[PDB]
Structures are given as C-alpha cells and as structure tokens.
C-alpha cells in the first residue's frame, strides 16, 4: 500500500538546493550498480550536506543495490537515521508536480524484479539493504527516488548528511 498523503522534497529540511548537492555516480561493477551510504552519511563538521547517488541506466537487466546504515550499527553515528519510503523497494518516490510522492515501483516499471529477501534477510531498509533488477525493455524514461537521511544525527559537534538515491532509467530494448 502507498500513503497517498505523503509529500516530501529532495532537499528535505537541509535547505540545500540541488546545485549544491554532492552528486555521485553509483558504484558499478558489471551489471550491478550500488549506492553505499555507510561512510558518506557519517557526521562531519560541515554537515548536514546532501549526498546524491545517481543510478543512470540505459542498458538492460541492471541490478541495483542501495545500502543505508542501520541505526545503532555504530554507537553514535546513525542515532537518528531515517529512510524513505519505509516500504522500499516496493514503494518509491517519484516527482509529482514539484514534490516527492509514493509510487508502486512494480506499476512504475513493468517487469521489475523485487526479490523478497536479500542474503536471506528481508529486502527492506530495516535490514540495511534493498535490491531490485530492472527488466530487459523499458519504454519510457523513469525517475524514482529513495531517501536515506542521517541529517538529524548529532555526534560531537558534527551532524550527519542527507542521502538521496535517484534512479534515472532511459529507454532501452525498444
């Protein structure tokens, strides 16, 4: 199910505009594109920063893996970490008008594989990682998002960062 009343923005409460995001390509090895936020979201003096991992796909059957550190995995570094949507990867965020709202990924990209588990654990951000595999044919350009936000975590005088995943799928196979 989706929460039709949910609305957010890419910048969240950081007040940073997109031109000031730190933007990165996903880590890509063969047909596996990975966004590992474990280190990039840890508290730093300058924080909160926005850390945007761009998963740009123009090839078929790409597997995508996102890694959001769990609260408490390290003593104080992820105290207040939040992920969005809570039901990822079954639910994603897509831009409607100018705001982020929930969408069923299976409806958004027909044929997408969402395995129930990941390394025998639930394919949910509460187990620290989510995975899905894109199909061999995408007819229309599609952009969806995941949020892994540690910007409300304070350690020392340091503050965590807001992580954004943007999956930009170009048409292919047609």
């Amino acid at each position, epitope marked *: 199910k989706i929460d039709l009343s949910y609305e957010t923005t890419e910048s969240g409460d950081t007040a940073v505009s997109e*031109d000031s995001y730190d933007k990165y390509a996903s880590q890509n090895t063969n047909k596996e594109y990975v966004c590992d936020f474990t280190d990039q979201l840890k508290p730093t003096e300058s924080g909160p920063k926005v850390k945007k991992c761009e998963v740009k796909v123009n090839e078929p059957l790409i597997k995508v893996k996102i890694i959001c550190p769990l609260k408490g995995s390290v003593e104080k570094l992820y105290d207040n970490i939040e992920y969005v949507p809570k039901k990822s990867p079954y639910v994603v965020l897509t831009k409607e008008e100018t705001k982020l709202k929930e969408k069923l990924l299976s409806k958004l990209i027909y044929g997408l594989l969402i395995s129930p588990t990941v390394n025998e654990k639930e394919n949910n951000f509460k187990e620290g990682v989510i995975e899905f595999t894109l199909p061999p044919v995408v007819h229309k350009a599609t952009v969806f998002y995941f949020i892994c936000d540690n910007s409300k975590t304070e350690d020392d005088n340091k503050k965590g960062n807001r992580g954004i995943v943007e999956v930009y799928v170009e048409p292919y196979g047609n």
Partner: single-chain antibody
Amino acid sequence: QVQLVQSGAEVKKPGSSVKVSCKVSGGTFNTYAIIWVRQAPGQGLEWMGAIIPFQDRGQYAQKFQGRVTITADKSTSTAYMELSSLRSEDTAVYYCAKESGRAVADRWGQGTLVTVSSDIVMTQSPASLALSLGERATLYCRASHSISSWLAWYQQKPGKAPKLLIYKASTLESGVPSRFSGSGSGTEFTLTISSLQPDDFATYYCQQYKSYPWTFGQGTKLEI
C-alpha cells in the same frame, strides 16, 4: 550559480504565435520542473504551466490549454514556451523558473516582454502599503482551501524578476537577511519584516505551491 537566460523582447500581431526560450545552466535540467509564469503590465503573476523535461509532457493551466506548448530540449538544456492565437491581453512579461529540490520555484529568468499590437484562490492584504524606515510591516495571505505549509513569499523590484524570500512557511532562503520572517499554516499566513531598510521597498506576492495550478496573491506594494 544557476542561471536562466530568456530570449529577447518581441512584438507580435494579434492572432499570431510567439515562442519564448529559456536556457538553464548551473543546475540539473532533466529531472527538475521548469515553470512558466507571466505578468501583465502593472498586474499580478499568472502561472501558465510546467514541465519536468524527462517526461516530455507539459502540464498547463486551463486558461491556456489549446494555445500553449511547453517543450524542453534536454540536449541543449533549454525550455521553450509557445503561445498561439495571441491577443492584446497576452501582452505581459513571461518568466521561466525552475525548482531545485525544494519544490518552490527558487531560480528565475530575467523575463521576456511580449507585446501584441496591430482551483485555490490566494488573497493578499494590504493591497498597498507605505511605512517609514525602521517600522514593521505585516503582510497577509488567505487561501480558499488549506495549502498545509507549502507557501512562499517573493519580492519583485521594478523591472526585475520575482525573488524568493521564504519557502515552506517560515524557512528563509539563503542570503535573505534575518529581519524577514514567516508564520502560518492551513489557509492563513503572514509575512513580517522587522526593520524596513532602503532595499525593502518593492512589490510582494504570496504563492501556494500545494497543487497545480499554482496561484499568486494579487500583491502588496510597499512604498516609501
């Protein structure tokens, strides 16, 4: 450093067509809404349409459907707005704007003058104002339906483009001095400046970005 450069002013015979271009630079183009707002001479801001370029599909205001076309060339990072069946009342300064991950249109082009010669309601008071240096000014904004906290305040100097001052409902844009403040939620909101200074005398507008069509208060002028 995001810049929006629009095509030059043009004069068009009634009934013809005009296409205004707008190059976006310094900011991601394909995945952020490019928005088009016009302002007729000595009047208020009017929302025309918007497009997230990768979708290749413009959403337009009912007034213009059948007459406008908002396109976007991803390869040149340029948006185009074409308005047909021109009339004398299409005379106005047309603006392109883009959002930057915060929903509000926070980056604005310089404006393009077009001359033709041969839904939520936002209510803003005071309609005009005049206050001395140092005094406090309190503007108001009403909405027919609740816009939650998605309300923005702009400052338009003469011959310039609207400048964002506050977004969400109290969040200050970067570089805006701390004398500005915003409060409110639902249908009633307020803007408040603490110490009027020389640069503060301009026209002010509120704007709901809860839902398309975005709509603007008729404006509150501030005079010396």
